[PDB]
Write a protein that binds this ligand. Structure first.
Ligand SMILES: CCN(CC)C(=S)S
Ligand SMILES: CCN(CC)C(=S)S
Ligand SMILES: [Ca+2]
Ligand SMILES: [Ca+2]
Ligand SMILES: [Ca+2]
Ligand SMILES: [Ca+2]
Lengths: 89, 90
């Protein structure tokens, strides 16, 4: 597989791992989203150390009101990050 | 890098690999898009060999109408591909 294909796989893999920890196995609850950001985006985003930060991040990502981040919403988050990086440079 | 950070960097790098080839170096024109797909998505998508298909794929991705695929449009393309992959293993 190409680097682009490996990237696509990485995206579905990391989501599956974190979303599958608790509750709805196809969505990220707050604790799951928090750990994904802290463990997997530590070089891009400041570490989350306040519950009010996780609350605000979920509020931003959650567009259908289940209080969770589904795959579509996670993809929007990834696009936000990749764009912010494409713009940082 | 974490696998996710690697993925983010790869997306940026592959886009610039191809977008820089010709023309504007910040958008994918049809020929740039065609070979990104044929070379870098050869395991996920059928190889493009017609003009009609190059045309239709660009028509689909070109949300702002300028005839090229910019980074935001490319990210939407990637979102399409990844979502299809996710719906599959699920
Ligand atoms: C400067 C950090 N940036 C995100 C704001 C990335 S490393 S792409
Ligand atoms: C072709 C299936 N592939 C699995 C590696 C994805 S769509 S990620
Ligand atoms: Ca979950
Ligand atoms: Ca949601
Ligand atoms: Ca270009
Ligand atoms: Ca366009």
């Amino acid at each position: 597989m190409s680097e682009l294909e490996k990237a696509v796989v990485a995206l579905i893999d990391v989501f599956h791992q974190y979303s599958g920890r608790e509750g709805d196995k196809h969505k990220l609850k707050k604790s799951e989203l928090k750990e994904l950001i802290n463990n997997e985006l530590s070089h891009f985003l400041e570490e989350i150390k306040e519950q009010e930060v996780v609350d605000k991040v979920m509020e931003t990502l959650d567009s259908d009101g289940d209080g969770e981040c589904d795959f579509q919403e996670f993809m929007a988050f990834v696009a936000m990050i990749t764009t912010a990086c494409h713009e940082f440079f």
